[PDB]
Design a protein around this ligand. Structure first.
Ligand SMILES: O=C1C[C@H](C(=O)N2CCC(c3c[nH]c4ccc(F)cc34)CC2)CCN1
Ligand SMILES: O=C1C[C@H](C(=O)N2CCC(c3c[nH]c4ccc(F)cc34)CC2)CCN1
Lengths: 320, 319
């Protein structure tokens, strides 16, 4: 494990590693600032690239053309595309009707979730073209529901929109549309009515909600709540822990990492439904937890957390 | 509303309401001490009536015979029966094979019965007319558990429900266990450790609301399907001073769709069972809630204590 300290008062909204260095979208500013951290030298440089805050980052790599583009999704709905080699070669795709609240890479596609519950689908070969429009736009929700996340079993894709879990495929038509507010009977009502912030797909769908210590477990086939993981109880068995879930992350098979707003990390064995390890006070608050392929067969876990004046830290370890 | 302080260091294990008055079994002693509190004068009297701690109490009222008997279940298995009018009229019934952990008066159409739950998971049944007979033997003894599982609670809505270990049992007129639900399976939704704990209380309404030992979770079970149909987590109800354990000590159903939950921290939550929402919260009512029951003269009686010195209080209020 190696801990890299970012420059003081830097806030990271989003993060994307490149196959070592990471591209970061900054939250300490109202404009669109893109930063770049060299994992080796710990070198940090930044640039103001867009008028509004960069909320999402997706790296779009095109093998046939041997080109990689870093896509930034801003608060105003801008899709800014910068070439990873030459930064001078940059442009914007069709501007979204609302904030870009999600960016995911799926033939390959660039999926865009918006604050008004829309999903824009671009193909790899379309990302390269200025002002390029999507193949289609899926109106899943409304202006009061944002499309926050996307995931896959690792075809069939799963995403979160408001309090709903949705699935789509090759045809790009909504298949499963599960209302999760139904968990109110087993979970605390306020947590059930919160918007889905993250989704992880294994044998079931594990979902986290805004300001909630409860991870809801849903069956993919029955479309019913088949379980609950309450971080408040896993942490207490010091008593003041909010246990709010900020990040959900699957490791291989039957292992789920949970990062809390109070800066704790819990690892659960899904096969035995038992807490393996808890890392208390990892930092003051855990923000992002993701897997990254950094080189040839170099697979690593990245944790972004911050301390209390803000001090953001990036922890790196080999995912065994 | 009013607060009646008991003499300093008096500990109440059990209560039964009967001026308005209450019979108390004391927990500040290793012998059987039966107390009496006049709820009007606040007058307190007690007497050492048995050799071991009184854990349970029940009033057996025979309106035909025009008599009333207070039944005390002790730590050694004694069922001591005392006449409420003449305390010199007293006798014991057949001694139980272990501690008396539950006493309840129920009716079946119409006959009335005294139900005796034991620490070795047994249920002895005595018809009301049997209770006035010295050394009387029960009508039937049902083995629902073992020495590890105490029959801790008994309730009704005629069908009797109870809890023995982590199993919920049901029985009717025939006195034969009908439904036997394993609750350890709440583990998928509830925190496993809470699911594995023994049942300490059961309330019967449209569903079964069960509390478990050292648990902030009220498990809600469906009588017809015999499957979990809800959870009421008191830690989250109290939080939305975040350090509350929210451990359930008592459950008491008030009239039509309203449940009172008394916690170890001295808090009382009131929930509307039809809207599943919280009506009222009484934060730091006392330091810790022990007993919560309804008495027809109508009134809600709460027994709490504050703490080398213990001060028990009784709070009474018109419903
Ligand atoms: O769809 C399925 C998958 C089910 C399964 O095997 N699952 C899903 C439910 C999961 C779950 C519930 N409660 C938990 C508490 C802690 C914890 F780590 C995990 C859980 C455990 C894995 C079996 C039937 N069918
Ligand atoms: O026969 C029935 C009635 C059941 C019902 O209607 N119930 C049970 C579940 C209960 C419940 C869940 N979560 C809560 C949170 C607070 C609170 F006060 C109460 C609850 C109250 C409603 C349905 C199946 N079986």
């Amino acid at each position: 494990s190696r801990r890299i300290l970012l420059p003081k008062n830097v806030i990271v909204e989003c993060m994307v590693a490149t196959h070592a260095s990471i591209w970061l979208g900054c939250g300490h500013t109202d404009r669109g600032q893109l930063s770049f951290l060299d994992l080796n030298t710990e070198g940090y440089t930044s640039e103001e690239v867009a008028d509004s805050r960069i909320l999402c980052l997706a790296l779009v790599h095109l093998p046939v053309e041997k080109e990689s583009w870093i896509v930034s999704g801003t608060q105003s709905g801008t899709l800014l595309v910068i070439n990873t080699e030459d930064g001078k070669k940059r442009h914007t795709l069709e501007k979204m009707t609302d904030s870009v609240t999600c960016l995911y890479c799926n033939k390959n596609f660039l999926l865009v979730g918006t604050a008004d519950g829309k999903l824009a689908i671009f193909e790899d070969k379309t990302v390269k073209l200025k002002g390029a429009a999507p193949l289609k736009i899926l109106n899943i929700g409304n202006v009061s529901t944002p499309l926050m996340c996307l995931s896959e079993s690792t075809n069939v894709m799963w995403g979160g929109c408001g309090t709903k879990i949705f699935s789509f495929s090759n045809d790009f038509t909504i298949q499963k549309l599960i209302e999760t507010r139904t968990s109110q009977l087993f979970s605390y009502a306020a947590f059930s009515d919160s918007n889905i912030i993250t989704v992880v797909v294994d044998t079931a769908l594990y979902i986290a909600k805004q300001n909630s210590p409860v991870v809801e477990v849903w069956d993919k086939k029955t479309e019913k709540l088949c379980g609950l993981i309450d971080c408040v109880h896993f942490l207490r068995e010091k008593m003041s822990y909010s246990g709010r879930v900020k990040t959900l992350c699957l490791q291989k098979n039957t292992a789920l990492w949970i990062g809390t707003g109070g800066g704790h990390i819990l690892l659960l064995d899904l096969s035995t439904r038992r807490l393996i390890r808890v890392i208390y006070n990892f930092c003051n608050s855990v923000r992002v937890m993701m897997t990254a392929q950094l080189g040839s067969l170099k697979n690593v876990m990245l944790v972004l957390g911050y301390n209390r004046e803000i001090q953001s830290c990036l922890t790196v370890w080999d995912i065994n």
